Structure 1
Amino acid sequence: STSQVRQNYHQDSEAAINRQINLELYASYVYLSMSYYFDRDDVALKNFAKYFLHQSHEEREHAEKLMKLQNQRGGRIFLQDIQKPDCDDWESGLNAMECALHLEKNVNQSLLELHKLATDKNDPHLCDFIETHYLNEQVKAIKELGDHVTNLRKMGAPESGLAEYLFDKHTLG
């Protein structure tokens, strides 16, 4: 049953990796939903749409890298349902950015718990995988989203549709 390549890879780490794969795919689905919300004719913020679509693809890449990790270590991928996002209607550019920030912080928390598990299981390869490919990415993404939220709020979003328009043009464009 044991993979010929498997070495120093705890069952709990394998399971946590599978959970993280699902979470990354979920985040990719959330961002896809947000993108096409901004593609609606009654919202019509193309650069918001582009931004979130890019994020969706990035999240898919993160999931695929975790799957590659899983196979590299000799764990076995078990996929689960990708739950639909919490919203169909994301209400505003600002609200979407706030939800994205919340999502990214939740993903970061899951990564931190993964790192803690790796450390506890004395899995330095896994620890450094997480550190190299995920943790800084998360910190950067959270910082960027926080900057966006700050700018939108200062501009007067979401009540100032001019605010969101000009943010779409000048920041995301």
Structure 2
Amino acid sequence: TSQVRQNYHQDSEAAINRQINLELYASYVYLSMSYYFDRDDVALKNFAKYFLHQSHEEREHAEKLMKLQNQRGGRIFLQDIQKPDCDDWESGLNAMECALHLEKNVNQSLLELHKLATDKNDPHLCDFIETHYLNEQVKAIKELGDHVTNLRKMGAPESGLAEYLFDKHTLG
């Protein structure tokens, strides 16, 4: 038991280890989406840059949780990072819809983590999650919803002109 550990429940420690794997998995999903748009038969450079940036940010979120685990006297335990479910993402609109779904799932996991921290009376963990994760998730979800709405209204994905213009004017 760590000399620094104080008011840090075993259940919280385990849940943090799970969240770490989830963020690394999200990073992997975004990495796959990015390079799909880099294909010569897809070729939407700004969609590709958008998802690569998202991939790097998810990786950063995971490292922040690893830092928190050590700060509290807990111990990091890593697991395999599962490959994404899809290899081909279909279209710009489909990719954005999948990302929205992914983000809502990560948000659900964070809300469950917050409830657990509350039940265990760990105010430091509650504030950490509120401060660094909760608001970021809400902003991310609103942004993806906006994008999905615009692509649909423009006539994507049936209209190839729609996806080309969105890549230039919104993501560019």
> Does the TM-score normalized on the shorter chain lie above 0.5?
yes
Category of TM-score, reference length = shorter chain: over 0.9
**Aligned residue pairs, count:** 172
Q: CA deviation at 1:160?
A: 0.7
Distance (whole Å) between structure 2 residues aligned to residue 56 and residue 100 of structure 1:
11
Q: 2: distance between equivalents of 1:47 and 1:3?
A: 47
CA distance in 1, matches of 2:5, 2:160: 55
| 1:22 shift after superposition | 0.1
Whole-Å separation in 1 of the counterparts to 2:51 and 2:144: 11
- 1:63 corresponds to: 62
- Percent identity between the two aligned chains: 100
Q: Give, in whole Å, the separation in 2 of the partners of 1:14 and 1:161.
A: 48
Secondary structure of the residue that 2:170 maps to in structure 1? helix
Alignment partner, residue 30 of structure 1 = 29
Structure 2 distance, partners of 1:118, 1:91, is: 39
Question: Matched residues in 2 for 1:107 and 1:119: separation?
Answer: 19
In the TM superposition, residue 127 of structure 1 has moved relative to its aligned partner by: 0.3
Distance across 2 between alignment mates of 1:163 and 1:6: 55
Structure 1: give runs of 5+ residues left out of the alignment: none
Note the alpha carbon deviations across 1:10-33, whole angstroms, 9 max, x for none: 011000000000000000000000
Deviation of 1:71 (Å): 0.5
**Any stretches of 5+ residues in structure 2 without a counterpart?**
none
The Cα offsets for residues 25-82 of structure 1, whole Å up to 9 and x where unpaired, read as 0000000000000001100000000000000000000000000000000110000000
Runs of 4+ in 1 over 6 A off after TM superposition: none
Provide the TM-score with structure 1 as the length reference: 0.99
Query: What is the deviation of 1:154?
Result: 0.4
Task: Give the C-alpha shift of residue 149 in structure 1.
Answer: 0.4
| Counterpart secondary structure, 1:67 | helix
* Residue in structure 1 matched with residue 142 of structure 2 by the alignment: 143
Tell me by how many angstroms 1:103 deviates: 0.3
Task: Indicate the RMSD between aligned Cα atoms, in angstroms.
Answer: 0.4
CA distance in 1, matches of 2:56, 2:111: 22
TM-score, L = length of structure 2:
0.99
